[PDB]
Amino acid sequence: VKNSIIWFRKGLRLHDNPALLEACKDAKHVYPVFVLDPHFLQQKVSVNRYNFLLESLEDLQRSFQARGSRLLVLRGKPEEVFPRVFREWGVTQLCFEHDTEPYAKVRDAAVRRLAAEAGVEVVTPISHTLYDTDMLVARNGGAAPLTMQSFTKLVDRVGDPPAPAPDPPAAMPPPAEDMPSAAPAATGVPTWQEVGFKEPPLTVFKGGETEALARLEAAFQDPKWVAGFQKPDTDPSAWEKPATTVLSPYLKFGCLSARLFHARLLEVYRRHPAHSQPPVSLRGQLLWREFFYTVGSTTPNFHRMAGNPVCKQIDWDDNPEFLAAWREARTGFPWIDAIMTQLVTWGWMHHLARHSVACFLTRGDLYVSWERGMEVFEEHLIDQDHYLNAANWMWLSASAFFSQYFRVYSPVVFGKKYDPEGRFIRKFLPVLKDMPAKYIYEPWTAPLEVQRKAGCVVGRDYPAPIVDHAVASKACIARMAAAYRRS
Ligand SMILES: Cc1cc2nc3c(=O)[nH]c(=O)nc-3n(C[C@H](O)[C@H](O)[C@H](O)COP(=O)(O)OP(=O)(O)OC[C@H]3O[C@@H](n4cnc5c(N)ncnc54)[C@H](O)[C@@H]3O)c2cc1C
Ligand SMILES: [Cl-]
Numbered sequence: 001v002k003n004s005i006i007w008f009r010k011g012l013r014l015h016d017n018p019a020l021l022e023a024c025k026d027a028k029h030v031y032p033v034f035v036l037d038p039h040f041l042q043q044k045v046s047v048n049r050y051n052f053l054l055e056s057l058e059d060l061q062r063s064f065q066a067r068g069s070r071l072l073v074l075r076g077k078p079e080e081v082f083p084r085v086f087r088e089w090g091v092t093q094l095c096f097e098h099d100t101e102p103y104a105k106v107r108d109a110a111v112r113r114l115a116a117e118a119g120v121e122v123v124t125p126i127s128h129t130l131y132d133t134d135m136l137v138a139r140n141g142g143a144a145p146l147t148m149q150s151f152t153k154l155v156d157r158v159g160d161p162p163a164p165a166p167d168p169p170a171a172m173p174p175p176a177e178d179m180p181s182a183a184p185a186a187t188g189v190p191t192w193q194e195v196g197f198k199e200p201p202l203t204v205f206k207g208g209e210t211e212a213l214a215r216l217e218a219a220f221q222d223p224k225w226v227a228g229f230q231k232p233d234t235d236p237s238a239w240e241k242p243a244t245t246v247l248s249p250y251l252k253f254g255c256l257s258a259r260l261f262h263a264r265l266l267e268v269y270r271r272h273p274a275h276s277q278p279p280v281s282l283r284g285q286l287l288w289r290e291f292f293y294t295v296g297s298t299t300p301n302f303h304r305m306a307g308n309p310v311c312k313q314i315d316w317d318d319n320p321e322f323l324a325a326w327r328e329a330r331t332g333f334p335w336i337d338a339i340m341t342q343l344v345t346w347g348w349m350h351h352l353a354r355h356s357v358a359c360f361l362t363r364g365d366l367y368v369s370w371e372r373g374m375e376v377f378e379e380h381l382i383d384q385d386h387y388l389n390a391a392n393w394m395w396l397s398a399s400a401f402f403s404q405y406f407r408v409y410s411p412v413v414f415g416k417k418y419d420p421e422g423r424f425i426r427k428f429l430p431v432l433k434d435m436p437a438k439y440i441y442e443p444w445t446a447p448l449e450v451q452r453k454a455g456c457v458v459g460r461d462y463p464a465p466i467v468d469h470a471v472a473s474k475a476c477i478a479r480m481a482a483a484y485r486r487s
Contacts, residue, residue, distance in 0.1 A: 001028040001090075001092075002026050002027050002028055002092050002093060003028055003029045003031070003089055003090045003091050003092055003093075003176070004022075004023035004024070004027045004029075004030050004091065004092065004094070005030075005032075005033050005085070005089070005091055005094045005095065006019055006020045006023040006024075006030060006032050006033065006095050007019075007033050007034075007035070007094060007095065008034045008060065008096070009034075009035075009096060009099060009104070010097055010252075010253060010254040011096075011127060011128060011254035012056045012057070012059075012060055012208075012209065012253050012254050012255050013060075013212070013254055013255050013256065013257060014063050014168050015165075015167055015209065015257055015260060016127060016164035016165045016257035016259055016260050017097075017127065017168065018125035018165045019095040019123065019124070019125050019127070020032075020095070020168055021166070021168060022123050022125070023093065023095040023123075024169065024172060024173060027173045028173055029089070029173050029174065029176045030069065030172055030173040030174070030175070031072055031085070031175050031182070032064055032069060032071050032072060033072050033073075033085075034060075034074070035074050035077070035078045035081055036073050036074065036075055036190070037075075037076070037077065038075050038076075038195070040195075041195065041197070042196070044379065045379065046201075046344075046379055046380045047192055047197040047199060047200065048201045048202065048203045048346075048347040048380065049249075049347060049381065049382045049384060050197065051192045051197075051201040051203075052201075052203070052206075052249055052253070052347075052382045053207060053253060054190065054195075054207070055207030055208055056207035056208045056209070056253055056255055057073065057189045058189050058207075058208070059207065059208030059209055059210050059211070059255075060209070063209070063210075064172065067169075067170060067171055067172045069172040069173070069174050069175070070174065070175060070184075070187075071187075071189065072182055072187040073187050073189050073190070074181070074187060075186065078111055079107075079110050079111070079114065082094075082111055082114055082115070083114050083118065084181060085181050086115070086120055087118065088180065088181055089175075089176065089181075089182075091118070091120050092119070092120060092121060093120065093121045093122075093123065094111075094115050094120050094122050094123070095122075095123045095124070096108075097124070097125065097126075097127050097128055098124045098125065099128065100129075100293065100297040101386050101387075102386075108124075127165070127257065127259065128254055128258070129289075129290055130258050130262055130286065131155070131158065131161055133290075133293055133294045133298075135158075136154060136155070136294055137294065137298055139154065139157070140154050143298075144298045144299075145291075145294070145295075146295065146310065146401075147401075148278075148279050148287070148288070148291055151287070151290075151291045151294070152287060155287065155290070160262075160266070161258075161259050161262055162259060163259065163263060164259045164260040202345045202346070203345070203347045203382060204346060205246065205249060205346070205347075205348060205382065207250075207255065209250075209256070211250070211255070212247065212250035212256035213256070215245065215246065215247060215250065215256075216245075216247065216260075216261065216264070219245045219247070220264060220268065223271070223272065224272070226268050226275075227268055227269060227272035227274070227275035228274075228275065228276055229276055229280075229282040230276050230280045230281070231244070231279075231280050231281075231282075231284070231351065232352075234350065234351070235350070235418050235419075236349075236350040236351070236352035236418060237350075237419035237423065238350070238418075239342070239423075239427055239428075242350065243350060244350060244351065245282070246348060247261070248383035248385075249347075249382040249383040251289070251383075252383045252385045252388075258286060258289070261286060262286055265282060265283045265286075289388060292387045292388050292390075292391040292392075293387050293388075295310070295387075295391070296386070296387035296390060296391060297387065302387065303386060303390045304371065305369070305370075305399070308400075310394075310400045310401075311394055311399050311400050312399045312400065312483070312487070314397075314399060314480070314483045315483070316362070316367060316369035316370075317367045317368060319366065319367075319368055322361075322366040322367075322466065323366070323372050323373075325463075325466050326340065326357070326360070326361050326373070326376075327340070327376050329341045329344070330463045330466075331360070331463075331465065332444070332462070332463045332465035333360070333411040333412070333441075333465055333469075334422070334425045334429055334432055334440060334441060334462075335356060335411050335414065335415040335441060336356060336357055336411050338424055338425045338427075338428040339353045339354075339356060339357050340357055342428050343357075343376075343377070343381065347381055347382035347383075348381065354377075354392070354396075355396060356409050356411065357373075358370070358373060358392070358393060358396035358397070359396055360409070361373045362393075362396060362397035362398075363396075363397050363405055363408070364408045364472075364473055364476055365467055365469060365472040365473060365476060366467070366472070367475075367476050369397075370393040370394060370396070370397035373393060374389055374390065374393045377389055377393070398480060398484075403484070405477060405480040405481070405484070406477060408473045408477065410469060411469060412441050412442055413441075416441050420437060421437045421440070422435075422440035422441065425440055425441075426440070429462075431456050431461055432456055432462065434453075434454040434455055434456065435450075435456055436454070443456065443462055444458045444464055444465060446458075
């Protein structure tokens with residue numbers, strides 16, 4: 001008989017899951033499996049992103065139960081768990097979504113050889129990206145495009161991405177009964193308290209395929225907003241109703257299919273002939289993701305500076321004090337500190353909010369390496385994506401793709417143009433709640449009388465700015481210009 005495993009790593013969803021469909025075809029028993037490392041914290045990861053993952057597993061668990069099945073959360077390392085459950089469960093086929101991350105290639109290669117010795121067939125469809133990324137490289141003559149313009153012409157020549165896969169059947173082949181490694185007490189979905197975290201999560205975005213689909217339909221409620229979407233024109237200070245889709249954590253974990261997203265976009269574009277075009281359109285935002293996945297997966301050492309062929313070698317400063325003040329949201333610039341507080345509380349900021357804090361840390365003010373700021377983002381972002389976090393940090397640091405280092409965002413003026421009252425600031429920096437609007441971006445410039453009346457004395461309740469922006473930005477521009485000419 002056929003007994004199959006569907007191995008979840010990314011692609012935490014039932015819609016558009018070709019790996020799940022194949023595992024279910026002609027199957028007598030299907031084992032939906034997620035492999036959890038119970039020592040991961042004992043090694044980095046915030047409770048916000050890890051709880052997002054656990055909520056995504058709880059959602060998968062309810063979905064299989066409605067279909068007569070059960071999600072199995074195995075504890076241990078994949079290289080030590082799969083050889084046991086291959087023989088115990090009589091597995092003949094193993095299915096999982098293709099992954100191009102560096103650790104995934106080493107892990108998945110080790111699993112294929114273990115499956116070959118057990119006589120297990122391995123099926124690995126591509127569904128986390130719009131296209132076969134290796135196909136795009138081969139169609140471009142054997143090298144990935146390094147600009148969004150040439151990448152967009154490539155995908156236009158390739159055509160539409162594959163259509164989303166049909167939904168799985170209403171009833172699934174359940175796991176076999178009384179298998180020891182499938183014992184419910186050892187395969188349940190753990191809570192965040194049980195895995196090691198001591199403080200609760202504060203994010204407002206719930207994990208799961210159900211929440212992903214609900215947020216998707218909410219974005220498509222107004223087809224005019226979808227068709228006219230222009231990413232650079234969106235509001236970074238909007239927090240009650242975020243100006244973008246906030247689908248990034250669901251696309252990172254695969255709770256939402258990129259192909260489903262793309263297919264819904266085309267349906268709206270076909271009825272709206274004046275819809276925006278790449279790179280600013282909503283479809284263009286999925287192409288930025290596809291672009292960075294394509295380049296990073298074919299570039300060695302893509303997440304680092306050294307050994308990276310596309311990353312410029314700049315001698316960033318090693319200033320632990322500047323990094324600590326930026327990390328702890330005590331730069332003294334309320335716009336910067338409010339975004340860094342949103343990072344640690346919500347785990348998600350608007351794209352242009354990330355521009356402000358990334359520029360301030362790197363090429364704009366503090367001249368700290370983008371690798372250090374990345375490590376802070378990787379800890380707290382619920383949408384932390386290896387290739388996307390890498391590429392945009394190199395972009396914002398003028399180390400790759402972006403080279404206009406004379407464009408330096410002001411930590412004072414940038415947010416005032418969208419939000420002159422400082423509503424975003426007052427929400428995440430409630431110490432400045434009573435500061436009049438005239439000084440909320442520059443609290444150090446307020447007379448001492450108003451500081452006392454607002455209960456926020458600079459230097460006692462809120463810190464003074466760690467740098468003068470005019471002085472620091474001038475120095476960084478002059479050092480970036482020297483770096484670009486000594487190449
Ligand atoms: C320093 C820095 C680090 C970043 N790190 C990440 C990260 O780890 N994970 C991440 O998903 N995005 C990252 N981005 C991109 C961007 O900030 C988010 O993708 C976006 O703001 C998420 O909001 P949204 O889902 O509403 O995006 P939308 O505007 O609705 O775009 C829809 C989708 O397109 C993709 N996308 C949008 N902008 C980009 C972009 N610039 N590059 C690549 N893909 C994009 C995402 O998958 C997103 O979900 C980073 C940007 C900066 C400046
Ligand atoms: Cl500006």
